[PDB]
């Protein structure tokens, strides 16, 4: 038997800042969801268009896994038909989606005294992002009708930091989120459930 590498993305130290969320393709392996309880039994399990029970006897071609870190209040923006800075400028799901969302608390892991400024996010952009889009631009944003000539009036840096602390309220503590997308295509299936 050959198991999937799930244990990697759930045990890594760095967790792919939201503004540069990483994507990994899982194929040709058996998905065992019982290992998730090793990392965190307490989970925020939730799925759309599918149930975890019927998911055990289905097959798929490729599975995409996305990961990033966000606050607790912004976890509600990760869903179809939602709005906000994160949903509009960092990561947007389509109106029609089939997958599951996982979230767990990681305060004592990522939080640190004096602030952890290693995580960044975007809040300014000219237009909204399309479903499953990524942008790593670093150019200054123009708010006025004048040309950009460096930081200054009406010229703001499009990136900012969170600065998590261990003494933060539960609403501001860091949360690690994982998104699983199931895909089907006219090719031989490679992922199925155990027997």
């Amino acid at each position: 038997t050959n198991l999937c590498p799930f244990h990697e993305v759930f045990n890594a130290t760095r967790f792919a800042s939201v503004y540069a969320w990483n994507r990994t393709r899982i194929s040709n392996c058996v998905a065992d969801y019982s290992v998730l309880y090793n990392f965190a039994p307490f989970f925020a399990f939730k799925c759309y268009g599918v149930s975890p029970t019927k998911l055990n006897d289905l097959c798929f071609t490729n599975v995409y896994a996305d990961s990033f870190v966000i606050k607790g209040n912004e976890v509600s923006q990760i869903a179809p038909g939602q709005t906000g800075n994160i949903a509009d400028y960092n990561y947007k799901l389509p109106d029609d989606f089939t997958g599951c969302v996982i979230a767990w608390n990681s305060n004592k892991l990522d939080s640190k005294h004096s602030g952890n400024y290693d995580y960044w996010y975007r809040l300014f952009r000219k237009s909204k992002l399309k479903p499953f889009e990524r942008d790593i631009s670093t150019e200054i944003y123009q708010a006025g009708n004048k040309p950009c000539k460096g930081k200054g009036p009406n010229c703001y840096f499009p990136l900012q930091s969170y600065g998590f602390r261990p003494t933060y309220g539960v609403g501001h503590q860091p949360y690690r989120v994982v998104v699983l997308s199931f895909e089907l295509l006219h090719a031989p299936a490679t992922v199925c459930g155990p027997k």
Binding site: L123, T167, G169, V170
Partner: protein, 597 residues
């Protein structure tokens, strides 16, 4: 593009930029107040300097957004606050001298002391010595000396600095297009741009004058009763129609008359309510008190305390080499961090103070969702009123009886209610005239209508005219008695207490009518009532986002302040005082004086 979007993005960036540096400075002040050390002082000073430098650079930048172009009041209010130039308009030398004068006056106040003229080796301090003397002492000459020496020693040093302080404050006020510093202070009640809810700074004086007239009747009977009591307590010193000596008011300034309960208690033979013995017998602790308090707020439908509240808060005096400032205060550090600092100890007063602080914390948590610049009470006195209504509701015999503290054998009677109302009045009704007179004198002085050679004269004139108190020793322009007060020396306001006293009774009456209470008002209890809780929460969420007039109208159905609730509350005592004063004289002579005979 438009200017509105530019201002919106600017404020969005400013909020996030300012939240962090606050968290740091807030944490630093807490760590300092929890453990006094040399390093914490320097750290707090550095954090405050950084915060001030940040506010400096953020200001002077929003000037590119004229207010005449904005139309959405939500952004207009946020912008109007940052445009304030403040003391930055003054020159460097003047600001430095003003700060030095403030620090010198604060040091003089916090370092004052007294020594016996006939025994310089014997010296005392205000907090440990003079308070205890004015509280427990009973001699006449001793109280006179304690009242005269402290003033003659301290006030005479702050007189010259206060004139320069007033001059600089008036200059700074006129620099910002204000008429004077009093007009600046009265700006917190200003409202414009909303038809049917506009309010001017001048109308406040008219409202205060109109409201103060209705309180004179009850105050006259209370003064008559207190004078009748004092004439028997201190014969050969109290005049039958003259004013009461200031040093006999139980305190150094005469703000509260609670200390006169032992001498004015009508029915001294009745059993007074004091559950301290029962609490000691049951061996309660601070956690028990705070949980019983939290249950009260839970019974009305309010949220529970956070987990970090119990882990980070300080609810007991360390009692070790570590020294902390024992003073009940509520701290809001942001980011969902709420803490309380209090040297709690087993006592009913501590129970009421814990209720008050939890009420403050509830309000602080209510408006946590509003923008940073709007996370504040719509009015100064709303916090204190919300905190005092809870203490009033909890102090009822029914509440203590439901929790098993008071035995059911206790029976209510007319005398108990009379004593309770008198105890409440001695505390509440006594401070209103003093506060009004002090604030009016302060405003008239800041206005410049009283030359320096009449300050102390008009002080005692207004005293004898309104409060009806005469000084035991005549003073000249060398003494400065108003400067012998904390709020006066530390540049604080006073009208907030008056506004809170007026608003708390209206809030209580509305919440009790919501719960369908019956009978006298002083027996109301809002426990186990969700309608009142929802009605209050509907307003606690507004915060600085709407005028206080609209909130008060949504709460009690009225816009302007009214005094009828207080009169309805104290009607029983007002009716009882007449039966006693029928054979007594009403009023006071403004000519008699202790040193005139």
């Amino acid at each position: 593009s438009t200017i509105e979007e530019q201002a919106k993005t600017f404020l969005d960036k400013f909020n996030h930029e300012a939240e962090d540096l606050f968290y740091q400075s807030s944490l630093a002040s807490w760590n300092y107040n929890t453990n006094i050390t040399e390093e914490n002082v320097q750290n707090m000073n550095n954090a405050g300097d950084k915060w001030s430098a940040f506010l400096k650079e953020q200001s002077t930048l929003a000037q590119m957004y004229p207010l005449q172009e904005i139309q959405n009041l939500t952004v207009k209010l946020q912008l109007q606050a940052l445009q304030q130039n403040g003391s930055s308009v003054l020159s460097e030398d003047k600001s430095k001298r003003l700060n030095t004068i403030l620090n010198t006056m604060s040091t003089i106040y916090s370092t004052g002391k007294v020594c016996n003229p006939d025994n310089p080796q014997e010296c005392l301090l205000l907090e440990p010595g003079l308070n205890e003397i004015m509280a427990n002492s009973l001699d006449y000459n001793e109280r006179l000396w304690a009242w005269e020496s402290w003033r003659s020693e301290v006030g005479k040093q702050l007189r010259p600095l206060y004139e320069e302080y007033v001059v600089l404050k008036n200059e700074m006020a006129r620099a910002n297009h204000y008429e004077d510093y009093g007009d600046y202070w009265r700006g917190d009640y200003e409202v414009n741009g909303v038809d049917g809810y506009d309010y001017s700074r001048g109308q406040l004086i008219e409202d205060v004058e109109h409201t103060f007239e209705e309180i004179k009747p009850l105050y006259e009977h209370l003064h008559a009763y207190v004078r009748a009591k004092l004439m028997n307590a201190y014969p050969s010193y109290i005049s039958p129609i003259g004013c009461l000596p200031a040093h006999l008011l139980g305190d150094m300034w005469g703000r509260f008359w609670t200390n006169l309960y032992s001498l004015t208690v009508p029915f001294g033979q009745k059993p007074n309510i004091d559950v301290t013995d029962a609490m000691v017998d049951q061996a309660w602790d601070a956690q028990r008190i705070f949980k019983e308090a939290e249950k009260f707020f839970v019974s009305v439908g309010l949220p529970n305390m956070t987990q970090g509240f119990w882990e980070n808060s300080m609810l007991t005096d360390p009692g070790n080499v570590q020294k902390a400032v024992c003073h009940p205060t509520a701290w809001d550090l942001g980011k969902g961090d709420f803490r309380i600092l209090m040297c709690t100890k087993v006592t009913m007063d501590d129970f009421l103070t814990a209720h008050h602080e939890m009420g403050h914390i509830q309000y602080d948590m209510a408006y946590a969702a509003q923008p940073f610049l709007l996370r504040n009470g719509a009015n100064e006195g709303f916090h204190e009123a919300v905190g005092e209504i809870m203490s009033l509701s909890a102090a009822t015999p029914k509440h203590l009886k439901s929790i098993g503290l008071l035995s059911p054998d206790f029976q209510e009677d007319n005398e108990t209610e009379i004593n309770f109302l008198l105890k409440q009045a001695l505390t509440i009704v006594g401070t209103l005239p003093f506060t009004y007179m002090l604030e009016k004198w302060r405003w008239m002085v800041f206005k410049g209508e009283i030359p320096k050679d009449q300050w102390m004269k008009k002080w005692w004139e207004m005293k004898r005219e309104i409060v009806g108190v005469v000084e035991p020793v005549p003073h000249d322009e060398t003494y400065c008695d108003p400067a012998s007060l904390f709020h006066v020396s530390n540049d604080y306001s006073f009208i907030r207490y008056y506004t809170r006293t007026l608003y708390q009774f209206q809030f209580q009456e509305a919440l009790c009518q919501a719960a369908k209470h019956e009978g006298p008002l002083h027996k109301c209890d809002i426990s186990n009532s969700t309608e009142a809780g929802q009605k209050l929460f509907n307003m606690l969420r507004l915060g600085k986002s709407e005028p206080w007039t609209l909130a008060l109208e949504n709460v009690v159905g009225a816009k302007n302040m009214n005094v009828r609730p207080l009169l309805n509350y104290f009607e029983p005592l007002f009716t009882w005082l007449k039966d006693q004063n029928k054979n007594s004289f009403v009023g006071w002579s403004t000519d008699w004086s202790p040193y005139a005979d």
